[PDB]
Amino acid sequence: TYYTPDYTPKDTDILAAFRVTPQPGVPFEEAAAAVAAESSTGTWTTVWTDLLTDLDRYKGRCYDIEPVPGEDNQFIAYIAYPLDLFEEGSITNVLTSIVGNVFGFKALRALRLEDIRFPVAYIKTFQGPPHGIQVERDKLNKYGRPLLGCTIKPKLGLSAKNYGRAVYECLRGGLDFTKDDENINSAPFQRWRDRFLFVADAITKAQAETGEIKGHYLNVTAPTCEEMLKRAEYAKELKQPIIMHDYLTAGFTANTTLARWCRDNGVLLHIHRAMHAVIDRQKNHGIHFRVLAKALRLSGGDHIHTGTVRGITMGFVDLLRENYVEQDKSRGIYFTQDWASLPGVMAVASGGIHVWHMPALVEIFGDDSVLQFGGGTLGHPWGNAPGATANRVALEACVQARNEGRNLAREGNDVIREAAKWSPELAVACELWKE
Amino acid sequence: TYYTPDYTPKDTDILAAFRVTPQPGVPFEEAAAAVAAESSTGTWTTVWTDLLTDLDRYKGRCYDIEPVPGEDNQFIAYIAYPLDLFEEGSITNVLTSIVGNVFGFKALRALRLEDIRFPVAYIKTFQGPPHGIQVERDKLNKYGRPLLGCTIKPKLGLSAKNYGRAVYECLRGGLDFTKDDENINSAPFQRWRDRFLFVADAITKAQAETGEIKGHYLNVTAPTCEEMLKRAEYAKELKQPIIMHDYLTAGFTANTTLARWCRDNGVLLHIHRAMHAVIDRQKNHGIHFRVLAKALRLSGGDHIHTGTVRGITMGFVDLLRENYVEQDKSRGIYFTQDWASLPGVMAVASGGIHVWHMPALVEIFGDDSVLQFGGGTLGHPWGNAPGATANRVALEACVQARNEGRNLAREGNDVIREAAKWSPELAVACELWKE
Amino acid sequence: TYYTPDYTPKDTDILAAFRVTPQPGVPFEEAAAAVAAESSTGTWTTVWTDLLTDLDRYKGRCYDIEPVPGEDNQFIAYIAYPLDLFEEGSITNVLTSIVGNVFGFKALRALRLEDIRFPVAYIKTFQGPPHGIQVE
Amino acid sequence: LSLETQEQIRQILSQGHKITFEHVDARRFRTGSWQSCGTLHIDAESDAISTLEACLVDYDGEYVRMVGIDPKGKRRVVETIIQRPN
Amino acid sequence: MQTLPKERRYETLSYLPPLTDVQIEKQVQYILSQGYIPAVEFNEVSEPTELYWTLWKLPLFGAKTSREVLAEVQSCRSQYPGHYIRVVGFDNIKQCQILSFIVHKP
Amino acid sequence: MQTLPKERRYETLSYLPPLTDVQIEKQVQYILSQGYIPAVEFNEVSEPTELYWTLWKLPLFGAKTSREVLAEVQSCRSQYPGHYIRVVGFDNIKQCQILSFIVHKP
């Protein structure tokens, strides 16, 4: 009474794709009816209270089973959940109802949520991104090109003043942004309020110098919800265009009250994807990143870490930027998702890239993305200021070559070496980070 | 006991003029006594509780019946209401007591309120306009001439930034004001807070350029009373001299708490007359606009849309501006209204006018009015900045000609054409919008 | 460019029924395209700013005309408005955008809104009744 | 079985879609709670007209309606009420 | 098509070509004809934020002809060549300025 | 080792050596090829705080070849030599500027 194949999904309904590995001697029908039941109005026994409420209308049910090719006791399950049973404008409930305790079931060894479709009716209740891509470019006055960020190294050690100067030299060369590390909060060695005051002196300095709008992501992530709002009251007070938060670690409810506040005040929020690798790593167990990416877009967020490069990564990148995306099973997308005019989230590329990966990342990610160099700028032979001008000239070279109409897959190593002739700073960096 | 012709109206009494069309077989006396009763202490039966309260003192009564010339079962009814029974400083009550459910009476097919007189004693309880004309000219430093506004087209479509630039080019040419459309609220495509931030950048830009005080009406109209006040907290914060509201659609109580707030903070309020045409259109049924114009002046409002041209329109225009206005039946005014030092409201003329209607509108409306060009400025062959300079030079030509002592009815086409000789921008616009 | 009969209404769209009485000498097509225009992204002249925003996507359009039986210059107009252009959880906007100043148009003597359909997607944004019958 | 019924039957099955017919008594129609009757995912005209006359008679005095189902994921394309209660 | 040049503008009657001394006489004739009180004002710098200029002598309460206001204009122009000067018209019934236009630039 | 000199920079394509009139032609060819609307903008002073420049004529809605955009560039260069000028490209589907680069310095 949970497994019903004949059922045809409605438009106002949330649909999910589960990769199921049952215990041997367990049929393909019963283990499918058990996760469809245990997520929504499911109980191990028949109880008398089920005859007063209408169970047929509310119940989630499995309508389609597809066996995974070249895999034994491995098949894809399609379950449909009526729209009414979830609360309005809360990721916390949709997360809680579906993927609650269907995991760690005795009937099955391994379980993995692959994808999740949102009907448009449900999409409307949320705020979504406080700004989006189109809005964000307009506040910063930057067009044509991918935006350039920088992570200060080392992660923990520097004083509040030393942090303030290491940030000053980087934006001076010609970086758009600078970034705080994901584990710096209110460490004893540098308190947050001191770090917040010295970074304020270095942005105004390099702003009046180069003559461009500069920024720095001020990590706001705090243990309690008072502290978080109170730290943010101070960033608004020093006229900071951007701050940043880790959503997975603080929780969805922490991330929610923030985004409402951020739309209230017109500050752009960066989101780091800290602690992602423990859930989405295993191909048999966990939840796929694309589910969490949607959940982020809906919670709200102007930027998001996507990870560096392939067929799978462009699946959930075009899923966060485009208004309408089509079902493509090879890419990794199981359902047709339609966003109701909701603004797009900008892709952030960070983690071990130098001036030779420069042709590869402008072509794949395109124009609406942020390129972030942790080790690639500071570790320049000549310091932070020459290391910045190195990465700036190398981006602008590939963007000019692309417009005129050159393939950057073919002439990728060619444009970097021409540019290396008239600029001294790129000649010493081409030498160091070789092939 | 409701129809008493011998009655002579007192000074502390509110008087009303109704155009009545009875059902055939209904005398002229009973249908007049029925609308005089059903608005105030009226019941279909004799009840016992009427012998404890003094009915004679409180009751409204019809004192004069005038048959409409050239009309069968059509006559003007004059009813007088004692001053005591209405609550103090509330349009909501006066609207509720009189024109409540006397409409949709079975005894009569059609009913129309023509006019409404306010005794001076009742007028004193209200705040009225937060500033008025004299006050408003003094904050903006503009004398001699009618003021020039612009409506951005299209109504819904543009991004928050594109709106910001389309407003920048218009005030640069030399318009006084720019204006938001009556249906733009918090649409998904541009959120209010983003629109509020970009318009702030473009005003400060064109202020430091041309060297004049510039403004833009920021539509504040919101679904709830918290949101409305909270959006306005933000407009005060960016130092905006003007905002605007639709009073009919939001209701009189919404419009009231606002006006109190606006006098508290020294912000000038524009009022759009959206949804007027459904009530005041029919000559047999509804309420005449002059009643609603009075109701606005008392509620409060620094500007008001009067509509483009004739004998009727100048009736309720001189009624909103003048301190003392006399009874004129040909003009359309039934009663002697006397305002107790209450400041005047400035006339706003908007809806389908070009540079050739320029002579006609300065003469009829006079000096204390706002002339607004929706389609006439943007649709210029050369863009928004030349289209603005076109309408500016055409106004200043007619104002100079008027002072020297030329009739603008005879020499109206003449002054527009001799101005077209030394300015290139008016020569291409004279070409386009012809006769 | 406002009157398009071939158009088939979507599910996420607000639809309206108007009883129209035009001024004599006014065709049945132009007075229908005029109330479909003047309520949403409508202007009496062609302006240059319309070539930067995508007008085709946002515009409300009349897809069906039905003549009223036993009535001369009286017909029912069916206009479809894309979902995006209204603000969320506010009657104030939907009332303002549609029945704003399409009334008191010179091209037509009398005008009456008969009915209004809400797509389910739009209905979800509101609180609606604080309790309802069952609760009460 | 009207001329409108068999053209829609033919229009549904000319798309490659499958037909499902559903009934409802007057009371549960309030809440839009219909159910399947006969054989689901019908892919030919004669199976459609046979179980249509089975369900017109099996649930006479109830609503009956025909569904056009795209077999790709079982997506509901077109819904039309054939029979209404007396 | 033509692009609109950047110009610093000066309130009323600034978009019209600079006024001849005859055009000046007709506009002040209009002030005395309506019965308003014409006066002369000067300031060093012209900005949208400041709303009070330095008053020249008194409002000429006893003004019969438009030539007595022109002679007050030339004596101030002579005294302050490097000042902005404008002529205003006070009304005494409605308590407001009717006309405000700039005659001499530094 | 070398210390980085202090330079005032001008948004996109300013770290590359000043553009030749052929490199100018290839970048506007890319604007008309993708189907976007190329336009000319000028301003007196270049600062990070101001985000609206004075628009030159109209956006050229009817642009077939990249040479018609170059002739509009040289006529503004001739009119205002002591102005900052840049060419932008409006998109009509996504409602946003794709490209913004500075061609002439005062």
Residue E1: helix, strand or coil by DSSP?
A: coil
Single-letter amino acid code for the residue at E46? S
Q: Which of A176, A138, A213 is nearest to F48 (CA)?
A: A213
CB contact under 8 A, E6 and F79: no
Q: Are residues B142 and B85 in the same domain?
A: no
Question: Any idea what DSSP says for residue B329?
Answer: T
Q: How far apart, in whole angstroms, are the C-alpha atoms of residue C22 and residue C25?
A: 8
E–F interface: beta-carbon pairs under 8 A:
13
Domain ranges, residue B12: 1-126
Do A399 and A276 share a structural domain?
A: yes
Q: Name which of B249, B263, B347, B340 is nearest B300 in CA terms.
A: B263
Q: Any residues with CB less than 8 A from the CB of B82 and at least 6 apart, and which? A: B13, B57, B58, B59, B60
D and E touch with 3+ CB pairs <8 Å, answer: no
Phi, psi (degrees; rounded to nearest 5) at B21: -125, 100
Distances (CA, A) of A90 to A286, A386, B110: 22, 46, 52
Distance of CA E6 to the CA centre of its chain: 24
Provide the CATH number for the domain around residue E101. Answer: 3.30.190.10
- Structure tokens given for C72: 């001369």
Chains in touch with A (3+ beta-carbon pairs under 8 Å) read B, C, D, F
Q: For residues A305 and A275, what is the distance between their CA atoms, to the nearest angstrom?
A: 12
**Strand E96-104 relative to strand E84-91, pairing:** antiparallel
DSSP labels, E55-70: EES---SS--STHHHH
Does F55 contact E3 at a Cβ distance shorter than 8 Å? yes
- Residue C36 in contact with residue C62, Cβ under 8 Å? yes
Residue of C nearest to A11 (CA): C11
CA-wise closest residue to A130 among A289, A232, A234, A242: A242
Q: Which of B80, B99, B126 is the last residue of a domain?
A: B126
Q: Which two tokens stand for residue D83?
A: 């029979």
Residue E13 in 3-state DSSP? coil
Q: In which element (H, E) is residue B147 found? A: strand B147-150
Are A393 and A425 a contacting pair, CB within 8 Å? Answer: yes
Compute CA distances D16 → A327, C3, D13, D42, D51, whole Å: 19, 34, 5, 10, 19
Nearest to F94 among A134, A209, A383 (CB): A134
Q: Which residue has the tokens 């148009």?
A: C105
Distance from CA of F31 to the nearest CA of E (A): 22
The CATH number given to whatever domain includes residue A253 is 3.20.20.110
> In this structure, are strands F54-56 and F37-43 parallel, antiparallel, or unpaired?
antiparallel
Among residues B59, B131, B214, B272, the one annotated as catalytic is B272
Q: How far is F71 from chain A (nearest CA, A)?
A: 20
Q: Regarding beta strands C108-117 and C61-67, do their DSSP bridges make them parallel or antiparallel, or are they unpaired?
A: unpaired
CB neighbour class for A132 (10 Å; exposed up to 12, middle 13-18, buried from 19) = buried
In angstroms, rounded to a whole number, what is the distance separating the alpha carbons of residues A335 and A64?
Answer: 13
Q: Could you tell me which residues of C are annotated as the binding site? A: 101
B431 annotated to a ligand binding site = no
E strands, A202-330, in order = 215-217, 242-246, 268-272, 286-287, 303-305, 324-325
Q: Residue B299: enclosing H or E segment and its boundaries? A: helix B289-299
- Beta strands at A108-117 and A177-179: parallel, antiparallel or unpaired: unpaired
Q: What is the 3-state secondary structure of B13-82?
A: EEEEEEEEEECCCCCCCHHHHHHHHHCCCCCCCCCHHHHCCCHHHHCCEEEEEEECCCCCCCEEEEEEEE
Number of H helices, E strands in chain D: 2, 4
Q: Domain boundary at A99, A126, A153, which?
A: A126
Chain-chain contact of B194 with A131 (C-beta, under 8 angstroms)? yes
The Cα-based distances of C26 to C61, C76, E26 in angstroms read: 19, 15, 50
Name the structure determination technique. Answer: cryo-EM
CB contact under 8 A, C85 and B187: yes
Residues belonging to the binding site of C for substrate are 101
Distance from C-alpha of B176 to C-alpha of B249, rounded to nearest angstrom: 27
Determine the Cα–Cα distance for residues C88 and A126; give it in Å rounded to an integer.
10
Query: Phi and psi dihedrals of B40, rounded to 5?
Result: -145, 120
CB atoms within 10 A of CB B417: 12
Distance CA B383, CA C52 (A): 13
Tell me, yes or no, whether B248 and B385 share the same domain: yes
CB contact under 8 Å between A138 and B198, yes or no, is yes
> Of the listed B139, B142, B153, B285, which one is catalytic?
B153
Residue A171 has φ and ψ, to the nearest 5°, of -75, -20
- Catalytic residue (one of A59, A216, A270, A272): A272
Confirm if D8 and D66 have CB atoms less than 8 A apart: yes
- State the total domains in chain A: 2
The strands making up A346-350's β-sheet, listed across from edge to edge, are A147-150, A369-373, A346-350, A303-305
A131 carries an active-site annotation: no
Render A375-403 in DSSP notation, one character per residue: HHHHT-TT-HHHHHHHHHHHHHHHHHHHH
E strand or H helix that includes residue D54? helix D45-58
Domain that holds residue E6: 1-106
* Helix pair A384-404, A358-365: axis angle to 10 deg: 50
Sheet containing strand D75-83, edge to edge, reads D35-36, D18-24, D63-70, D75-83
Beta-sheet pairing, B369-373 with B346-350: parallel
- Asked whether the beta carbons of B153 and B375 are under 8 A apart, the reply is yes
What are residue E88's DSSP bridge partners?
A: E39, E100
Q: Hey, what amino acid is at C56?
A: D
User: Residue C106 is encoded by which pair of tokens?
Assistant: 């010179």
* CB contact (8 A) between residue C122 and residue A125: no
Residue A275 CB: number of other CB atoms within 10 A?
A: 12
- Helical spans, DSSP H, in A54-191: 55-58, 91-98, 120-123, 133-140, 160-173
How far is Cα A194 from Cα A186, in angstroms, rounded to an integer?
10
Residues of F in contact with A396 (CB under 8 A): 12-16
Whether A134 has its CB under 8 Å from any CB of chain B: the answer is yes
Chain B contact set for A341 (CB, 8 A): 188-189
Specify whether A120 is located in the same domain as A145: no
Domains held by chain F: number: 1
Tell me, yes or no, whether B51 and B164 share the same domain: no
Q: Show residues of chain B in contact with A342, CB under 8 Å.
A: 188
* Probe site for chain C from A124, A323, A339 (most C CB atoms < 10 A): A124
- Of B397, B311, B313, B308, nearest to B357 by C-alpha is B308
Distance CA B157, CA C84 (A): 10
Single-letter amino acid, residue B374: G
Let me know if chains C and F touch, i.e. at least 3 Cβ pairs under 8 angstroms. yes
Q: Residue A181, annotated ligand binder?
A: yes
The per-residue DSSP string of C66-87 comes to EEPTT-TT-EEEEEEEESTTSP
- Token pair for E105: 């630039």
Distance from C-alpha of F48 to C-alpha of A211, rounded to nearest angstrom: 6
Question: Are C65 and C76 in contact, with CB atoms under 8 Å apart?
Answer: yes
C23 by DSSP, 3-state: which?
coil
Q: Which helix (H) or strand (E) holds B228?
A: helix B225-237
Closest Cα partner for A369 from A395, A402, A331?
A395
Contacts of C48 in chain F (CB under 8 A): 58-59, 61
Q: What 3-state DSSP class applies to A103?
A: coil
Which three-class secondary structure state does DSSP give residue E47? coil
Give the chain A residue nearest C123 (alpha carbons).
A121
What pairs with residue E89 in β-bridges? E38
Report angle CA F69, F72, F73 to the nearest 5 degrees: 90
Active site residue B434: no
Rounded Cα distance between A3 and A5, Å, is 6
CA distance B318 to B212: 30
**Backbone φ/ψ region at F25: left (φ over 0), alpha (ψ -120 to 50), beta:** alpha
Last-in-domain residue among A80, A95, A126: A126
